[model samples]
Target chain A: HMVKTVYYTASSLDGYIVDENQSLDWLTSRDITPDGPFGYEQFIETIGVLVMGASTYEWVVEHGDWSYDQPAWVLTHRPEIAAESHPMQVFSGDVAELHPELVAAAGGKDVWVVGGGDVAAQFVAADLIDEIIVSYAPCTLGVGSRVLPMRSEWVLDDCARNGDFVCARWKRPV
Target chain B: SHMVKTVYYTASSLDGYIVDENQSLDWLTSRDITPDGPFGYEQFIETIGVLVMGASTYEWVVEHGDWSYDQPAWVLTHRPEIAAESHPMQVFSGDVAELHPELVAAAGGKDVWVVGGGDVAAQFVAADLIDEIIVSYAPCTLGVGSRVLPMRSEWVLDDCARNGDFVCARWKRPV
Candidate 1:
């Protein structure tokens, strides 16, 4: 059994994932607008497993009014209370308990860890995440919820900075 | 002045130095990076607000500033610049208490970024004004320039790890 986990994000040159409000408006503009150079259409084609924290799930389900076309996992305590959607299911516990199921659910494809910060932090802390794709934006967001909440400790394996975008993929070494 | 929640975003060597002592950006540009398509970097750009930095970091950028950043910028300094960009630049000096207000105001509810060069970053770390310390550790090293940190305080290693060709560390001081 093989599990491939990854993070796909946009950040400031100063390493911010989102703005003070956790708004993706500026980021969306780059990916969605016709003039924006950030590429999004290509990403949607490859991602299989979609994981998000409870708050981020709420944010997207409420605001974006969007739903994933793939099997999605939400980290939450009150899964029963969340609104009904076809593709989403709650993880009963941590990755140790969830990875096998998550891997099975992906049908043997890459996982997409879309976060609002804290959610991604948990995965990083757990060493459940394997790769990270960070788009280092040209602007800086001075205040906001943050990309990764608080503190964490995990060693990096492979890393590099590329293009106008500072992107990389990380994983805890075995 | 200090920047609250400033994100230090730059490429560094495995030893934890931002650049060689010569103030060079060469180490960063040379590393081979994976193509952006596999990861959604464009999607992440939706968030941004203000940029913060030290005098040296400012000088480095000033020497090579580009049209890429159209957002407001705050330079943490003792003296103000006589000629600065009206829509995007501000120069200030003091503590986080003295600087956070303007940094916050300018963030426009976005985030304020703390660009680096060890001397000024040390102050924010001391004040605990920085909400997060995000470091992207490159695989190489610089024998000369400044180290990633100057004097240090303990920041809980909330999350420190690596990716494709870099090690990313996330840190914070408890409230």
Candidate 2:
């Protein structure tokens, strides 16, 4: 079975994953659980290795608590920002060069691209992402980090509602 | 009871831009969708009596072609003289909150379509005058452009569906 690579995250209805000031209050304050439809509970079970951009990694580091158990990778030119104790491996340069390692690290499960949009754009430009799932919160931030900053098309696969969010899934066109 | 609704109805890129940085809507116009499709503009506009847009959007429409709207329209602009003599439109420059009453009275029980360029939507949102927002999301993304809405606001998902190449959704302001 081919290892699937998915970019899964939440966004405001206006397409922002984070607000203008780089805040996640709009997302975290929503009334949804990880186990709900398109929730993290079942989604995490399918993810074997995780990838994130520098900004996303830094945001987690600054926000407190680093609780990712599956092998994780942080894409950044400056790797020194990663905590010495953090088990995440750091990589830079082309994501195409790094994709093989992510697939290998997955041990045959799947690779999860946790994002800041630009990172997903890179993977998308490289044609590495196989699926995208976004749960849109019931709000609009107007200006902020985009959910996906690149031009691409996807075949709408599924859609549903979880609490205050409208979740949808899309598969990369073959 | 005749209720008047103010709906911000517009199309946007997947990345939430209404128009590309070049102020072009080729991306949206190039898409394929019928006026009778899911969340179709034809059905939505049938309920609208008054139309409102910002100066920039107004200019875009004027440049694109003739003024096509038949509903009583209003252009929020400092330069009211720019409005053409042939079109039936009212130009006003003031706080939207103060002008909303006139729009509501003119609607005559019909809804208001807040045709936008983001800035106008922001003002209506700030004034707590907008009732619903219906967006038709295209599949493309423009890295930079005019945003769909330039203000923070909460909404409740009213409906969503796929209409050809676009994913359309309707949202209502929280009560």
Candidate 3:
């Protein structure tokens, strides 16, 4: 039960997470096999707890149910931002302090940093994220939300392909 | 059957951007790499018969790039009068389509290298003049900077490898 914190997400060839309009239309339209190598299906099975930001929380709430059985934590400034109905705890502070809570709640499972760049970067800067995994879409988005807005380094561990994507897994610099 | 190829090869942040917001390459320059390792620059230069880049790229090389490559070089610029003229490079201020033929001719059965500023690479890409794209991705992320390729185009992944602290990959245009 090694609880490793990981950031897993998709990015365009040009390193964009979403288009300028904040629409994942460019990402969602792509093709990928659930059972394929480096696919989301296999990655999701490795998660025990989820950690995300306000926008990600709202987007998930607006898009569909909080289908994840794993306990979730939302980092937000305003207290009203997080409603208690969903299976998540709300916290607003340095991720360095929050990491312990996430590790404790994982119940011996890896922590998943379900992100959209900004949140993931916080964990990254704090040296909390163990691995940075990205599935790069073939097309480039000229302008959009960046994948990681901060400067960080990693060791190239492995890479593979899944329909319409060239995926890579990088471990944080030791 | 001596054929020529067109390639766009450069280093980039993990998020796929080239230079940082401050128009700097310090992050890229401070990286660790094996010069003769897999996807290294030494082997790549031997294959380049001719090369083309944008004015900004030219300016950077003038200031920072240490070695003078043997390949014939061209720079795209409107303000080409930048004092000294011993760089052994020609400057042009026209459409890349018009200059592409000259590049191919200069290549002379080797490879035409697109030393990019992204916009310049986009031009070659849009004109379908580029055949392959190779990148050495550094381990850092620059939230703002020049894009690696600012266009919508698909590529077939040819291969990938790890060199030092970077991950390098080569991709070819779809047939």
Candidate 4:
């Protein structure tokens, strides 16, 4: 079966997800913190595989203290990382290479492909992602970096909005 | 090394144009500093780190901005010498991709805030440099002005959330 990869993020009204530093301050400052109809702790339980870029990983490491036991993949050409665990893998190859492994590792579950934008966009171009879950925050970063790296073309499918978060399922048509 | 991130924070009309067809921003110019109630400007002042903008927006700001910025401001433009002493401003031009890195680097880990006119800021958004967007909905919308982000490509609305009177959303690859 194909892998169901989900890109999860929050963006400003202008559609950027971070400032130039990749810091979410511009995003966080506005604060539309969800009141939790989804029960996030419960939602996190559904993930089987996780992926993120090096810089995003850095941001998470710097700001978040929680740890994940599920397998995590970091997309980077850099030889070293500050942390490594059995569930953590650093990917240095084309983004397409990770799919099969991610599919297999999912064990028929779901994969969460998080991002810093470049990785998310590459995966989009490679036709490897399936769903997108974003928490649209209320603010504009005023131009820094985007959650999707603003490509010139890409199509969406099965789009809908729930609460303040927008959810959609997408595919690249041949 | 510290990674520099920038964000463009502004709003446009529903049509995706930054200003009216006439190109006159008099509505903005005509409004008083304390027009009605509490304006978002004060909130905007606290959140931005460094602001990146184009010549036109810079010019409007020079005439206005009302001394809101206490941080450094960089203008992406062909004119490199337009300096506003009240604000720490610099002018840069030609190949934003080439110059953005250096400009952002100087911000030193602070999120680069892209203050803009649509043409200037949208380029970075197209390039995937902008990080986050916080669009505030005013009491009114311009019937025929510039748009928020004007790319024809179909982007998935990954998540949608809202604050009082504001609808904010994030988009990403559907995976």
How many residue pairs collide in each prediction? 41, 1, 0, 58
Would you list the clashing residue pairs of candidate 2? A34-A40
lDDT values for all models: 0.59, 0.85, 0.83, 0.58
- Alpha-carbon shift of residue B92 in model 2 (angstroms): 1.3
**Isolated chain B TM-score per model:** 0.78, 0.95, 0.95, 0.70
Which parts of model 4 have CA positions greater than 4 angstroms off? A29-43, A84-87, A150-174, B1-175
> Candidate 3, fnat value?
0.65
lDDT of 4 by residue, A1-174 (tens): 555777766655445666666466643433232335432454467688888888877767767655777788888887476465333787887888778898788867778887766787788778776665545443344455555643322233333354444433334443
The sequence of per-residue lDDT tens digits that candidate 3 reaches over residues A72-102 is 8899886576655566788999999999989
TM-score of each: 0.49, 0.89, 0.88, 0.48
Best by lDDT: 2
Top candidate, metric DockQ: 3
Q: How big is the positional error of residue A17 in model 2, measured in Å on the Cα after superposition?
A: 2.3
Q: Model 1, stretches more than 4 Å misplaced?
A: A31-39, A65-67, A149-166, A171-174, B1-175
TM-score of chain A of each: 0.74, 0.96, 0.93, 0.78
Per-residue error for A44 in candidate 3, Å, reads 2.3
Residue lDDT tens for model 3, B41-95:
8888888899899989888887775657888899999876852455768888878
DockQ of each: 0.04, 0.58, 0.59, 0.05
The sequence of per-residue lDDT tens digits that candidate 1 reaches over residues B101-134 is 7777887677666777666666766766766666
